[PDB]
Design an enzyme around this catalytic site. Structure first.
Site, short mmCIF file in Angstrom:
data_model
loop_
_atom_site.label_atom_id
_atom_site.label_comp_id
_atom_site.label_asym_id
_atom_site.label_seq_id
_atom_site.Cartn_x
_atom_site.Cartn_y
_atom_site.Cartn_z
N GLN A 85 11.51 4.79 3.32
CA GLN A 85 10.80 3.56 3.65
C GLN A 85 11.05 2.42 2.66
O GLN A 85 10.98 1.25 3.03
CB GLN A 85 9.30 3.80 3.63
CG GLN A 85 8.77 4.75 4.65
CD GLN A 85 7.35 5.16 4.33
OE1 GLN A 85 6.90 6.23 4.72
NE2 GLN A 85 6.62 4.30 3.63
N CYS A 141 5.68 4.15 7.29
CA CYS A 141 5.72 5.56 7.63
C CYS A 141 5.54 5.77 9.14
O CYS A 141 6.21 6.61 9.74
CB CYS A 141 4.62 6.33 6.88
SG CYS A 141 2.96 5.75 7.25
N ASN A 191 9.06 13.92 6.08
CA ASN A 191 8.48 12.72 5.50
C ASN A 191 9.53 11.61 5.52
O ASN A 191 10.64 11.83 6.02
CB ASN A 191 8.02 12.99 4.06
CG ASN A 191 6.94 12.02 3.59
OD1 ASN A 191 6.68 10.98 4.22
ND2 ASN A 191 6.26 12.38 2.51
N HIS A 211 -1.14 8.41 6.12
CA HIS A 211 0.30 8.49 6.13
C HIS A 211 0.82 9.23 7.36
O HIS A 211 0.40 10.35 7.66
CB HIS A 211 0.74 9.20 4.84
CG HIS A 211 2.23 9.22 4.63
ND1 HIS A 211 2.93 8.11 4.23
CD2 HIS A 211 3.14 10.21 4.80
CE1 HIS A 211 4.22 8.41 4.17
NE2 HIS A 211 4.37 9.68 4.51
C1 LIG Z 1 2.36 4.23 5.20
O1 LIG Z 1 3.59 4.09 5.31
C2 LIG Z 1 1.24 3.46 5.99
N1 LIG Z 1 0.40 4.44 6.76
C3 LIG Z 1 -0.10 4.29 8.04
O2 LIG Z 1 0.29 3.44 8.86
O3 LIG Z 1 -1.13 5.20 8.33
C4 LIG Z 1 -1.67 5.56 9.64
C5 LIG Z 1 -2.37 4.33 10.28
C6 LIG Z 1 -2.73 6.67 9.35
C7 LIG Z 1 -0.59 6.22 10.51
C8 LIG Z 1 0.29 2.69 4.98
C9 LIG Z 1 0.50 1.17 4.98
C10 LIG Z 1 0.03 0.38 3.74
C11 LIG Z 1 -1.17 1.06 3.04
C12 LIG Z 1 -0.79 2.47 2.56
C13 LIG Z 1 0.08 3.29 3.55
#
Ligand SMILES: *C(=O)[C@@H](NC(=O)OC(C)(C)C)C1CCCCC1
Length: 215
Positions: free
Chosen positions: A19, A25, A182, A162
């Site tokens: 990423q 993610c 991941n 995540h």
């Molecule tokens: C990680 O890449 C992002 N996670 C995410 O979209 O979580 C879901 C909604 C639970 C799938 C975030 C984006 C920025 C804040 C930390 C991690």
């Protein structure tokens, strides 16, 4: 012999991505699920464009997070998603530059697994292929993972932060697990992967936000 499947062996999984400095993610999880279905439905896959999703899924927050179902829905409504090569990842949100000429996969909908159900999740992995899931990946113990079947009692299933991809499941040394892809590079975990405890009371909330696209 105990049930188990590893879709990496079957050619359903592409190489592990990174990423970079972007909370994308979710985009990689979605693309990973779409890729698995491409292999399943057509016999061959290619790298799909997470950038296409970051820039075009208005219902999500680009590098600020998003939902996999939102991406699937977008691929469906949009009549397509570009290949990685046609729409390369730059790790920062930009204006949506989708181009049908580079379309590499389509989607006819999606299905969400019953919340908290590892049995339904296992059936989905076995009957559909790789599925998009979200977990609590904030723990230091999750982050420095290298081997074995990860399990940490303090993992908060009520704090999914995540998105990741369930590429299979099995058991290692009497420990049931989910094979997880991941998107923190091949440098992270075991060549980009992590074995997460299966049937350990929905550890880290592995079955709370799982879904797969219909192709
Ligand atoms: C990680 O890449 C992002 N996670 C995410 O979209 O979580 C879901 C909604 C639970 C799938 C975030 C984006 C920025 C804040 C930390 C991690």
């Amino acid at each position: 012999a105990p049930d188990s499947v590893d879709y990496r062996k079957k050619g359903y999984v592409t190489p592990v991505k990174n990423q970079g400095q972007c909370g994308s993610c979710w985009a990689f999880s979605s693309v990973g699920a779409l890729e698995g279905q491409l292999k399943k439905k057509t016999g061959k896959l290619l790298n799909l464009s997470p950038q296409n999703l970051v820039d075009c899924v208005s219902e999500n927050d680009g590098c600020g997070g998003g939902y996999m179902t939102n991406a699937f829905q977008y691929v469906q409504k949009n009549r397509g998603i570009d290949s990685e090569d046609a729409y390369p990842y730059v790790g920062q949100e930009e204006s949506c530059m989708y181009n049908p000429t580079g379309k590499a996969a389509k989607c006819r909908g999606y299905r969400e697994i019953p919340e908290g159900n590892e049995k339904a999740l296992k059936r989905a992995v076995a009957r559909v292929g790789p599925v998009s899931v979200a977990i609590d990946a904030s723990l230091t113990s999750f982050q420095f993972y290298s081997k074995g079947v990860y399990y940490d009692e303090s993992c908060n299933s009520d704090n999914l932060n995540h998105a990741v991809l369930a590429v299979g499941y099995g058991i290692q040394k009497g420990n049931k697990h989910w094979i997880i892809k991941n998107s923190w590079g091949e440098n992270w975990g075991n060549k980009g992967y992590i074995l997460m405890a299966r049937n350990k009371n929905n550890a880290c909330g592995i079955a709370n936000l799982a879904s797969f696209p219909k192709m």
